[PDB]
Amino acid sequence: ALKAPVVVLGAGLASVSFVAELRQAGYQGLITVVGDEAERPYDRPPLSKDFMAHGDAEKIRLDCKRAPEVEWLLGVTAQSFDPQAHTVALSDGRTLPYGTLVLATGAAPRALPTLQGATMPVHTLRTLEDARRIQAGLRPQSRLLIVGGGVIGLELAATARTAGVHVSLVQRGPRLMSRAAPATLADFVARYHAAQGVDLRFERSVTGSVDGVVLLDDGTRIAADMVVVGIGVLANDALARAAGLACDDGIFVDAYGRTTCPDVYALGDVTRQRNPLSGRFERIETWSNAQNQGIAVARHLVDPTAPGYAELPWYWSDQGALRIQVAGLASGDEEIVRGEVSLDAPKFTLIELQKGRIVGATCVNNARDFAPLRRLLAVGAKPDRAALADPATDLRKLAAA
């Protein structure tokens, strides 16, 4: 069932959350974690937020207190594993035996093929090292180009503008946040960033670059001192692929975290898993999944009577003045707008319904509403639609009832 010793590959949030839950649940056997970064395990969301602004890494470290008696092999890369011999080969020449193996290796930013042989600074933003390297080029009045209009690029955009950096952003699609965000939210977010001086370019792609200038597919040019590419990430599933596990930009797992290989599990950004709301498999790229899936898989390993992972997806994003929170699906057959959608003191809530059932919710500067909406979302509530729009209605009431 849960066979000792436990080895976890990756030392990010999913891994930390998993090994802490193992200990809290009562497992007292060996746990060894292999982490390729030579860094005290740390959280990523600050990297495009407060960290990029203030630069104190000792404010972003994960709490490994609830994970006593774990050996963390930092700065070491797992190079392969042999699922028959039950061993992992490490880059330092050592080998770890395992009873249970857990792949928590995350994902890495996609490169932009058109900028491959570029001769100007081109970075991505995933690691503490990336953030330090980017932060060191945020010279006031310098020009930054961001490729991709996902939340991390937008968080960087807002951080950069706040630092006095001129920001341009190129987005292949007609809208920002094309992944898991209601169109109404995306349109509003574009209006916000535009108003803050971000030069937004929709429906354009990068074709290449020459001497410090980026080329676009409309035949035009954008000069920049630095490009940050943020067009999404790819699962770090190479070990799983080589060992014969079912993978496709992500290791396939069930609700117990099981891969297709006996005694090998996977969690976090590296997994492709069932979204309970859509009923489809997808790679979920959020902080809450990394933590919550790690916890669920550990809990069930120690107590096989515990249910499989069942949490519904949600995330947040801090983009200057906008505190954004998004849960569930981006769309259904109906959207209910609570409040006015306005650049003047932005504060609104969106609710997505499918045949009367809540399937998604968004809060912008409205954190008190988010928690009740997530509970209503969780039980598939079908509240009165007039009430939901009715600003008099208090949402915490409904959830309680």
Ligand X SMILES: Cc1cc2nc3c(=O)[nH]c(=O)nc-3n(C[C@H](O)[C@H](O)[C@H](O)COP(=O)(O)OP(=O)(O)OC[C@H]3O[C@@H](n4cnc5c(N)ncnc54)[C@H](O)[C@@H]3O)c2cc1C
Does 70 engage in binding with a second copy (CB under 8 A)? no
Partner from a second copy, ligand X, none contacting 369, C-beta within 5 to 8 A by type: none
Alpha carbons 102 and 152: distance in angstroms, whole number: 27
- Helix then strand count (H, E) for the chain reads 10, 26
Q: CB of residue 102 vs a second copy: minimum separation in angstroms? A: 14
Instruction: Among 202, 256, 281, 287, indicate the residue that binds ligand X (CB under 6 A).
Output: 287
**φ, ψ of residue 27 in degrees (nearest 5):** -70, 130
For the residues of 145-176, what is the DSSP string, one character each? Answer: EEE--SHHHHHHHHHHHHTT-EEEEEESSSSS
CB half-sphere exposure, 75, CA atoms < 13 A: 3
Shorter beta-carbon distance to ligand X: residue 131 or 336: 131
For the residues of 44-67, what is the DSSP string, one character each? Answer: SGGGGTHHHHH--GGGSB---TTS
Does 125 engage in binding with ligand X (CB under 6 A)? yes
Q: CB of residue 3 vs ligand X: minimum separation in angstroms? A: 21
Helices (H), 10-150: 13-25, 50-54, 128-135
Does 286 engage in binding with ligand X (CB under 6 A)? yes
Partner from ligand X, a second copy, none contacting 255, C-beta within 5 to 8 A by type: a second copy
Shorter beta-carbon distance to ligand X: residue 213 or 238: 238
Site string for ligand X, 3-22 (x = CB under 6 A): ------xxxxxxx-------
With tokens 């120690």, the residue in question is 302
Sites for ligand X among residues 39-98 (CB under 6 A): 44-45, 47-48, 77-78
Segment interacting with a second copy, rule: CB under 8 A, options 128-136, 175-183, 246-254, 385-393? 246-254
Strand partners, 364: 324, 348
Does 266 engage in binding with ligand X (CB under 6 A)? no
Question: What are the residues binding ligand X (CB under 6 A)?
Answer: 9-15, 34-37, 44-45, 47-48, 77-78, 104-107, 125-126, 152, 236, 239, 268-269, 285-288, 290, 315-317
